[PDB]
A and B are shown apart, each in its own frame.
Chain A
Amino acid sequence: LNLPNLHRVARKLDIDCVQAITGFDFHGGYSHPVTDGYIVCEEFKDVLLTAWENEQ
Protein backbone atom coordinates (compact mmCIF):
# COMPACT_ATOMS: atom_id res chain seq x y z
CA LEU A 1 0.00 0.00 0.00
CA ASN A 2 1.44 3.36 -1.07
CA LEU A 3 0.02 5.49 1.73
CA PRO A 4 1.98 8.26 3.50
CA ASN A 5 2.27 7.92 7.28
CA LEU A 6 0.82 4.40 7.03
CA HIS A 7 3.42 3.11 9.50
CA ARG A 8 2.15 5.47 12.21
CA VAL A 9 -1.37 4.09 11.81
CA ALA A 10 0.05 0.56 11.98
CA ARG A 11 2.03 1.53 15.09
CA LYS A 12 -1.15 2.84 16.74
CA LEU A 13 -2.94 -0.38 15.71
CA ASP A 14 0.04 -2.60 16.68
CA ILE A 15 0.02 -4.08 13.15
CA ASP A 16 3.22 -5.27 11.48
CA CYS A 17 4.38 -2.79 8.83
CA VAL A 18 7.57 -3.23 6.78
CA GLN A 19 8.84 -0.73 4.22
CA ALA A 20 9.06 -2.07 0.67
CA ILE A 21 12.43 -1.64 -1.06
CA THR A 22 12.40 -1.33 -4.86
CA GLY A 23 15.82 0.11 -5.64
CA PHE A 24 18.89 2.02 -4.51
CA ASP A 25 19.81 5.62 -5.33
CA PHE A 26 23.45 6.67 -5.57
CA HIS A 27 22.81 10.37 -4.92
CA GLY A 28 25.32 12.18 -2.75
CA GLY A 29 28.11 9.68 -3.39
CA TYR A 30 26.48 6.96 -1.26
CA SER A 31 23.86 4.29 -1.88
CA HIS A 32 20.52 4.74 -0.11
CA PRO A 33 17.60 2.28 -0.31
CA VAL A 34 14.44 3.55 -2.00
CA THR A 35 11.19 2.92 -0.12
CA ASP A 36 7.95 2.58 -2.10
CA GLY A 37 4.91 2.03 0.09
CA TYR A 38 4.56 -0.45 2.92
CA ILE A 39 3.91 -4.20 2.82
CA VAL A 40 1.09 -5.18 5.19
CA CYS A 41 -0.83 -8.42 5.65
CA GLU A 42 -3.89 -8.77 3.43
CA GLU A 43 -5.98 -9.91 6.41
CA PHE A 44 -5.39 -6.56 8.13
CA LYS A 45 -5.35 -4.64 4.83
CA ASP A 46 -9.07 -3.83 4.90
CA VAL A 47 -8.97 -2.67 8.53
CA LEU A 48 -5.75 -0.73 7.95
CA LEU A 49 -7.18 1.24 5.01
CA THR A 50 -10.18 2.50 6.98
CA ALA A 51 -7.99 3.42 9.95
CA TRP A 52 -5.55 5.29 7.70
CA GLU A 53 -8.44 7.17 6.07
CA ASN A 54 -9.78 8.14 9.50
CA GLU A 55 -6.29 9.23 10.60
CA GLN A 56 -5.91 11.38 7.47
Chain B
Amino acid sequence: FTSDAKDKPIGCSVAISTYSMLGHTTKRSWEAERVMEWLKTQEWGLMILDEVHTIPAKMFRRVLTIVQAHCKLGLTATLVREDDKIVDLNFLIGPKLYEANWMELQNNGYIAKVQCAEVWCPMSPEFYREYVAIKTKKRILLYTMNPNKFRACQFLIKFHERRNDKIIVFADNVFALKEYAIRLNKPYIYGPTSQGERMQILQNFKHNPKINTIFISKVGDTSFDLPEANVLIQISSHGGSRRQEAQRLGRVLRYNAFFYSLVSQDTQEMAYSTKRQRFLVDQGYSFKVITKLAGMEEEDLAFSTKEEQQQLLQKVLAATDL
Protein backbone atom coordinates (compact mmCIF):
# COMPACT_ATOMS: atom_id res chain seq x y z
CA PHE B 1 0.00 0.00 0.00
CA THR B 2 2.15 2.84 -1.33
CA SER B 3 0.02 4.31 -4.18
CA ASP B 4 2.26 2.81 -6.88
CA ALA B 5 0.59 -0.40 -8.09
CA LYS B 6 -2.46 -0.79 -5.81
CA ASP B 7 -2.42 -4.59 -5.68
CA LYS B 8 -5.87 -4.74 -4.05
CA PRO B 9 -4.79 -4.20 -0.41
CA ILE B 10 -8.39 -4.80 0.71
CA GLY B 11 -8.76 -8.33 2.02
CA CYS B 12 -5.13 -9.26 2.63
CA SER B 13 -3.16 -11.38 5.07
CA VAL B 14 0.08 -9.37 5.28
CA ALA B 15 0.12 -5.71 4.27
CA ILE B 16 3.33 -3.74 3.70
CA SER B 17 3.35 0.06 3.56
CA THR B 18 5.47 3.00 4.68
CA TYR B 19 5.31 5.97 7.01
CA SER B 20 4.35 9.49 5.88
CA MET B 21 1.23 7.99 4.27
CA LEU B 22 -0.53 6.53 7.30
CA GLY B 23 -0.21 9.91 9.02
CA HIS B 24 -1.19 12.29 6.23
CA THR B 25 -2.29 15.68 7.53
CA THR B 26 -3.79 16.71 4.17
CA LYS B 27 -6.51 15.41 1.86
CA ARG B 28 -5.92 11.77 0.93
CA SER B 29 -6.51 9.93 -2.32
CA TRP B 30 -9.95 8.38 -2.79
CA GLU B 31 -8.56 4.86 -3.22
CA ALA B 32 -6.08 5.53 -0.41
CA GLU B 33 -8.87 6.92 1.77
CA ARG B 34 -10.97 3.78 1.26
CA VAL B 35 -7.96 1.54 1.94
CA MET B 36 -7.21 3.42 5.17
CA GLU B 37 -10.86 3.21 6.22
CA TRP B 38 -10.78 -0.56 5.66
CA LEU B 39 -7.44 -0.88 7.47
CA LYS B 40 -8.58 1.04 10.56
CA THR B 41 -11.49 -1.37 11.14
CA GLN B 42 -9.70 -4.58 12.18
CA GLU B 43 -7.05 -5.77 14.62
CA TRP B 44 -3.47 -6.48 13.56
CA GLY B 45 -1.12 -9.19 14.79
CA LEU B 46 2.57 -8.33 15.19
CA MET B 47 2.71 -4.87 13.64
CA ILE B 48 6.28 -4.74 12.36
CA LEU B 49 8.13 -1.41 12.24
CA ASP B 50 11.39 -0.96 10.34
CA GLU B 51 13.98 1.72 11.13
CA VAL B 52 12.37 2.20 14.54
CA HIS B 53 15.04 4.71 15.60
CA THR B 54 13.18 7.50 13.80
CA ILE B 55 9.84 6.60 15.39
CA PRO B 56 9.65 9.46 17.96
CA ALA B 57 8.74 12.16 15.44
CA LYS B 58 5.90 14.66 15.26
CA MET B 59 3.88 12.55 12.81
CA PHE B 60 5.37 9.06 13.14
CA ARG B 61 4.24 8.59 16.75
CA ARG B 62 0.54 9.07 16.01
CA VAL B 63 0.85 6.35 13.35
CA LEU B 64 1.02 3.95 16.29
CA THR B 65 -2.19 5.46 17.68
CA ILE B 66 -3.91 5.69 14.28
CA VAL B 67 -3.92 1.88 13.86
CA GLN B 68 -4.78 -0.89 16.31
CA ALA B 69 -2.44 -3.84 16.83
CA HIS B 70 -1.66 -6.33 19.57
CA CYS B 71 2.13 -6.68 19.36
CA LYS B 72 4.41 -3.92 18.05
CA LEU B 73 7.79 -5.31 16.99
CA GLY B 74 10.41 -2.73 16.06
CA LEU B 75 13.64 -3.49 14.21
CA THR B 76 16.65 -1.24 13.68
CA ALA B 77 20.42 -1.33 13.31
CA THR B 78 21.32 2.11 14.75
CA LEU B 79 19.28 2.84 17.87
CA VAL B 80 21.35 5.96 18.62
CA ARG B 81 19.48 9.23 18.11
CA GLU B 82 19.85 12.85 19.16
CA ASP B 83 17.30 14.97 21.06
CA ASP B 84 17.15 12.16 23.69
CA LYS B 85 13.84 10.87 22.30
CA ILE B 86 14.90 7.21 22.54
CA VAL B 87 13.58 7.16 26.12
CA ASP B 88 10.11 7.88 24.71
CA LEU B 89 10.46 4.74 22.56
CA ASN B 90 10.52 2.68 25.77
CA PHE B 91 6.79 3.28 26.29
CA LEU B 92 5.84 4.07 22.69
CA ILE B 93 6.53 0.45 21.71
CA GLY B 94 8.29 -1.45 24.48
CA PRO B 95 11.60 -2.18 26.19
CA LYS B 96 14.91 -2.81 24.46
CA LEU B 97 14.74 -6.58 24.01
CA TYR B 98 17.96 -7.69 22.30
CA GLU B 99 21.22 -5.90 21.50
CA ALA B 100 23.61 -7.85 19.30
CA ASN B 101 27.28 -7.87 20.32
CA TRP B 102 28.98 -6.76 17.11
CA MET B 103 32.49 -7.81 18.17
CA GLU B 104 31.57 -11.45 18.80
CA LEU B 105 29.30 -11.32 15.74
CA GLN B 106 32.23 -10.46 13.48
CA ASN B 107 34.47 -12.90 15.37
CA ASN B 108 32.29 -15.73 14.07
CA GLY B 109 33.13 -14.58 10.53
CA TYR B 110 29.54 -13.94 9.42
CA ILE B 111 30.05 -10.16 9.64
CA ALA B 112 32.91 -8.55 7.74
CA LYS B 113 35.75 -7.40 10.00
CA VAL B 114 35.83 -3.79 8.84
CA GLN B 115 39.07 -1.95 9.63
CA CYS B 116 37.77 1.49 10.58
CA ALA B 117 40.05 4.41 9.70
CA GLU B 118 40.00 8.11 10.58
CA VAL B 119 42.52 9.86 8.33
CA TRP B 120 42.66 13.65 8.28
CA CYS B 121 44.27 16.06 5.85
CA PRO B 122 45.84 19.45 6.60
CA MET B 123 44.07 22.59 5.44
CA SER B 124 45.73 24.24 2.47
CA PRO B 125 46.78 27.86 3.13
CA GLU B 126 44.66 29.09 0.21
CA PHE B 127 41.60 27.76 2.07
CA TYR B 128 42.40 28.34 5.75
CA ARG B 129 42.47 32.14 5.45
CA GLU B 130 38.94 32.10 4.04
CA TYR B 131 37.88 29.48 6.59
CA VAL B 132 38.92 31.68 9.51
CA ALA B 133 37.68 34.83 7.76
CA ILE B 134 34.07 33.65 7.30
CA LYS B 135 31.75 32.50 10.07
CA THR B 136 28.19 32.92 8.71
CA LYS B 137 27.77 29.20 7.92
CA LYS B 138 29.59 29.61 4.59
CA ARG B 139 32.59 27.59 5.82
CA ILE B 140 30.82 24.25 5.26
CA LEU B 141 31.98 24.11 1.63
CA LEU B 142 35.50 25.28 2.51
CA TYR B 143 36.78 22.29 4.47
CA THR B 144 34.55 20.07 2.32
CA MET B 145 36.48 21.07 -0.83
CA ASN B 146 39.94 20.86 0.77
CA PRO B 147 42.46 20.15 -2.02
CA ASN B 148 44.44 17.87 0.29
CA LYS B 149 41.32 15.86 1.14
CA PHE B 150 40.51 15.72 -2.58
CA ARG B 151 43.98 14.33 -3.31
CA ALA B 152 43.68 11.79 -0.49
CA CYS B 153 40.28 10.63 -1.75
CA GLN B 154 41.54 10.33 -5.32
CA PHE B 155 44.58 8.37 -4.14
CA LEU B 156 42.40 5.98 -2.14
CA ILE B 157 40.00 5.55 -5.07
CA LYS B 158 42.81 4.74 -7.49
CA PHE B 159 44.58 2.40 -5.06
CA HIS B 160 41.43 0.41 -4.32
CA GLU B 161 40.42 0.31 -7.99
CA ARG B 162 43.87 -1.07 -8.88
CA ARG B 163 43.13 -4.02 -6.56
CA ASN B 164 39.53 -4.46 -7.82
CA ASP B 165 37.61 -3.46 -4.70
CA LYS B 166 34.05 -2.13 -4.71
CA ILE B 167 33.94 1.44 -3.39
CA ILE B 168 31.00 3.48 -2.10
CA VAL B 169 31.73 7.16 -1.50
CA PHE B 170 29.31 8.95 0.81
CA ALA B 171 29.27 12.74 0.63
CA ASP B 172 26.69 15.23 1.88
CA ASN B 173 26.50 18.80 0.49
CA VAL B 174 25.59 17.69 -3.03
CA PHE B 175 26.82 21.04 -4.34
CA ALA B 176 30.37 20.00 -3.47
CA LEU B 177 29.69 16.45 -4.66
CA LYS B 178 28.95 17.80 -8.14
CA GLU B 179 32.49 19.08 -8.73
CA TYR B 180 33.83 16.20 -6.63
CA ALA B 181 32.41 13.57 -9.00
CA ILE B 182 32.55 15.33 -12.38
CA ARG B 183 36.26 15.96 -11.80
CA LEU B 184 36.98 12.22 -11.76
CA ASN B 185 34.22 11.48 -14.33
CA LYS B 186 32.56 8.88 -12.13
CA PRO B 187 28.88 8.06 -11.56
CA TYR B 188 27.13 9.94 -8.77
CA ILE B 189 23.62 10.06 -7.35
CA TYR B 190 22.49 13.66 -6.93
CA GLY B 191 19.48 12.18 -5.13
CA PRO B 192 16.54 13.82 -6.91
CA THR B 193 17.72 12.39 -10.25
CA SER B 194 14.94 9.90 -11.02
CA GLN B 195 13.76 6.49 -9.89
CA GLY B 196 15.03 4.56 -12.92
CA GLU B 197 18.47 6.14 -13.22
CA ARG B 198 19.44 5.37 -9.62
CA MET B 199 18.11 1.82 -9.92
CA GLN B 200 20.05 1.07 -13.10
CA ILE B 201 23.21 2.72 -11.76
CA LEU B 202 23.11 0.60 -8.61
CA GLN B 203 22.23 -2.48 -10.68
CA ASN B 204 25.21 -2.13 -13.02
CA PHE B 205 27.49 -1.05 -10.16
CA LYS B 206 27.99 -4.59 -8.85
CA HIS B 207 28.22 -6.79 -11.97
CA ASN B 208 30.63 -4.62 -13.94
CA PRO B 209 34.44 -4.71 -13.70
CA LYS B 210 34.73 -1.54 -15.79
CA ILE B 211 32.96 0.61 -13.17
CA ASN B 212 33.20 -0.22 -9.47
CA THR B 213 32.93 3.15 -7.65
CA ILE B 214 29.91 5.40 -7.05
CA PHE B 215 29.12 8.59 -5.16
CA ILE B 216 26.09 8.90 -2.87
CA SER B 217 24.60 12.10 -1.42
CA LYS B 218 22.77 11.24 1.81
CA VAL B 219 20.60 8.79 -0.14
CA GLY B 220 22.35 5.73 1.30
CA ASP B 221 21.61 6.85 4.86
CA THR B 222 18.72 4.36 5.11
CA SER B 223 18.05 0.66 4.50
CA PHE B 224 18.45 0.07 0.75
CA ASP B 225 19.51 -2.82 -1.49
CA LEU B 226 23.06 -1.60 -2.08
CA PRO B 227 25.31 -4.48 -3.19
CA GLU B 228 28.33 -5.75 -1.27
CA ALA B 229 31.14 -3.21 -0.96
CA ASN B 230 34.56 -3.39 0.67
CA VAL B 231 35.68 0.26 0.76
CA LEU B 232 33.67 3.21 2.06
CA ILE B 233 35.01 6.78 1.95
CA GLN B 234 32.82 9.41 3.62
CA ILE B 235 33.57 13.12 3.18
CA SER B 236 31.70 16.05 4.75
CA SER B 237 28.96 14.07 6.47
CA HIS B 238 26.28 15.58 8.72
CA GLY B 239 27.10 17.44 11.92
CA GLY B 240 27.04 14.91 14.74
CA SER B 241 24.71 12.16 13.54
CA ARG B 242 26.04 8.97 15.09
CA ARG B 243 23.09 7.22 13.45
CA GLN B 244 24.25 8.27 9.98
CA GLU B 245 27.81 7.02 10.51
CA ALA B 246 26.56 3.76 12.01
CA GLN B 247 24.27 3.23 9.01
CA ARG B 248 27.11 4.00 6.59
CA LEU B 249 29.33 1.49 8.39
CA GLY B 250 26.43 -0.96 8.10
CA ARG B 251 26.49 -0.67 4.31
CA VAL B 252 29.94 -2.32 4.17
CA LEU B 253 29.70 -5.28 6.54
CA ARG B 254 27.69 -8.25 5.29
CA TYR B 255 40.10 -7.73 7.26
CA ASN B 256 37.57 -8.52 4.53
CA ALA B 257 36.56 -4.85 4.25
CA PHE B 258 37.63 -1.45 5.54
CA PHE B 259 36.15 2.05 5.50
CA TYR B 260 37.81 5.46 5.72
CA SER B 261 36.59 8.83 6.99
CA LEU B 262 38.24 11.98 5.67
CA VAL B 263 38.21 15.16 7.77
CA SER B 264 40.01 18.50 7.68
CA GLN B 265 42.35 19.47 10.51
CA ASP B 266 41.83 22.63 12.58
CA THR B 267 38.15 22.73 11.57
CA GLN B 268 34.80 21.80 13.07
CA GLU B 269 35.03 18.51 11.17
CA MET B 270 37.59 17.30 13.72
CA ALA B 271 35.18 17.78 16.62
CA TYR B 272 32.30 16.39 14.57
CA SER B 273 34.22 13.21 13.73
CA THR B 274 35.35 12.84 17.34
CA LYS B 275 31.80 13.21 18.67
CA ARG B 276 30.18 10.98 16.02
CA GLN B 277 32.49 7.98 16.55
CA ARG B 278 31.60 7.51 20.23
CA PHE B 279 28.85 5.06 19.25
CA LEU B 280 31.14 2.77 17.26
CA VAL B 281 33.83 2.74 19.95
CA ASP B 282 31.11 1.63 22.38
CA GLN B 283 30.28 -1.02 19.79
CA GLY B 284 33.96 -2.01 20.01
CA TYR B 285 35.43 -0.47 16.85
CA SER B 286 38.71 1.45 17.00
CA PHE B 287 39.56 4.28 14.59
CA LYS B 288 43.24 4.27 13.66
CA VAL B 289 44.56 7.73 12.80
CA ILE B 290 46.42 8.00 9.48
CA THR B 291 48.45 11.17 8.97
CA LYS B 292 50.65 10.14 6.01
CA LEU B 293 49.66 8.33 2.82
CA ALA B 294 52.30 6.09 1.27
CA GLY B 295 53.18 7.00 -2.30
CA MET B 296 51.30 10.31 -2.30
CA GLU B 297 53.79 11.76 -4.79
CA GLU B 298 54.37 8.41 -6.52
CA GLU B 299 51.71 9.18 -9.14
CA ASP B 300 50.02 12.30 -10.47
CA LEU B 301 46.91 13.57 -8.67
CA ALA B 302 44.56 16.49 -9.16
CA PHE B 303 45.39 19.93 -7.75
CA SER B 304 49.10 19.16 -8.11
CA THR B 305 50.05 22.83 -8.55
CA LYS B 306 48.93 25.98 -6.76
CA GLU B 307 47.33 27.52 -9.87
CA GLU B 308 44.26 25.28 -9.93
CA GLN B 309 44.17 25.23 -6.12
CA GLN B 310 43.83 29.02 -6.03
CA GLN B 311 41.43 28.91 -8.99
CA LEU B 312 39.23 26.64 -6.86
CA LEU B 313 38.81 29.52 -4.40
CA GLN B 314 36.80 31.64 -6.85
CA LYS B 315 34.41 28.81 -7.72
CA VAL B 316 34.01 27.75 -4.08
CA LEU B 317 33.28 31.35 -3.06
CA ALA B 318 30.99 31.81 -6.08
CA ALA B 319 28.01 30.40 -4.15
CA THR B 320 27.07 33.70 -2.45
CA ASP B 321 23.63 32.31 -1.57
CA LEU B 322 22.20 35.55 -0.21
A and B in contact, CB less than 8 Å: no
